[PDB]
Amino acid sequence: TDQIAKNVKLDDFIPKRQSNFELSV
Amino acid sequence: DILDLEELREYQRRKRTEYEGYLKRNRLDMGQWIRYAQFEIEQHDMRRARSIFERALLVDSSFIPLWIRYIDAELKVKCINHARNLMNRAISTLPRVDKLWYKYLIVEESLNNVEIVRSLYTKWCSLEPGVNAWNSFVDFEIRQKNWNGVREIYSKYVMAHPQMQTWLKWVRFENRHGNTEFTRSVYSLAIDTVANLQNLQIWSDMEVAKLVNSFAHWEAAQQEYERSSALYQIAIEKWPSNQLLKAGLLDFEKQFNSIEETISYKRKMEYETILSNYDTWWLYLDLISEFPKQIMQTFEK
């Protein structure tokens, strides 16, 4: 119940630039 | 042969020494690891087996079969929590492999912890897995007698897989469902979504054509053909490159005029004919069918 494989999550797959280019690292 | 206790101990030792030795050379021969673990299981010392599995896992995690074997070994001695914990851990490690998830699911199903299988399924689906995962989940949620929350996951199953096959499957489901109102509603939704993301940012013309066809035949079963007609007009209006669309429309007209059917369909055949090269037959057809300016222009061509 919201703990099954709590280590994994989808936001790690999400590219954090594909949404917002010129995300100035 | 293996009579007394101490003697058995000696046997165990010797065997271990062999197995250990062979592992030492080829740290990776998972066949050798799993065989050794089987030996441990046979001996009915579970802790040592577990240790072996752990070591094996460490040596090579990516070998899924090892994981499966460990799992099943755990299951064997009705040490179900250990199996479950392990399987969770496996999931955590390698979520993008499916067989682990399925192994978990079957375990839980046999356990009849149905709530937990729902919960886990929610998780797995949430990770944007393969379509297969979604489909299996649906089957589970249909094997589960209820028909609500399933709706939500279908809605999400589009969210992860915006594919027309998904939509079509959903429609099929609603066909199983008693209330026809939702069928039409679903169609309306799908069409609306297609409209909204009209521009080249999805599936090809094919999928949309298929959808339109399906909708048209649903309506055909239903009363309101007026709305079908309107949709068709809208479709030709909203979409250009209407070979598929026009074809479908033509078919519908034929079903449900004749001149038009022969005309557009025949013309398509000419296009098809052109694509092949009976080009003479094409031109002739055009001439007969026509419009006559396009007959003589295309004739000249």
Binding site: - | K254, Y265, M269
Partner: protein, 192 residues
């Protein structure tokens, strides 16, 4: 729906049987190949490009029938002929070219092809496509009508049992050296 077609044909005397044809089409229920065929038959006898289109539809959709595919092909090619021609023989051929239903098809192809350079091509096709050996005999015969090339064809056919010997002998009639070759090839065959 056959009954409907019949009654319609009778009292209304093809518009009643055209929508009857539509009904048949719409009866997506089994024994539908027959229905489509019957409609097609009626549609030619009651009398056109619409009809052709319908035929095409029937063909494409009833591909997994495995029953009167040859017949269907005949209906198509025949229809084309009625409308008109040789490319329609290739249409029939195609339909026929696309196992035991296909055997019948190939016989149909043979029939068409004997009814037919283009003929040669057809022969090459059909032959190329156990039944194959028979086909070879067919096209080899065709070659016999069309002396060197024919001989070669015959040889090829042989290379693909004792009815082939007969064929070879016949060819040799169509030459002393040729007969000698025939003995040679026959001997070789025996050896194998």
């Amino acid at each position: 729906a056959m009954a409907e077609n019949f009654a319609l044909f009778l009292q209304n005397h093809v518009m009643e049987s055209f929508q009857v044809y539509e009904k048949t089409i719409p009866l997506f229920p089994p024994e539908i190949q027959y229905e489509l065929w019957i409609e097609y038959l009626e549609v030619a006898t009651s009398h056109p490009e619409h009809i052709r289109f319908l035929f095409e539809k029937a063909l494409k959709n009833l591909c997994s029938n495995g029953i009167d595919c040859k017949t269907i092909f005949i209906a198509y090619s025949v229809f084309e002929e009625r409308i008109s021609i040789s490319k329609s023989i290739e249409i029939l051929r195609r339909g026929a070219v696309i196992l035991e239903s296909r055997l019948q098809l190939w016989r149909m192809c043979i029939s068409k092809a004997e009814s037919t350079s283009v003929t040669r091509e057809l022969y090459q096709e059909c032959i190329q496509i156990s039944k194959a050996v028979e086909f070879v005999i067919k096209f080899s015969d065709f070659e016999s009508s069309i002396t060197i090339r024919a001989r070669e064809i015959l040889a090829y056919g042989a290379k693909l049992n004792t009815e082939l010997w007969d064929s070879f002998e016949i060819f040799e009639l169509k030459x002393x050296x040729x007969x000698x070759x025939x003995x040679x090839x026959x001997x070789x065959x025996x050896x194998x």
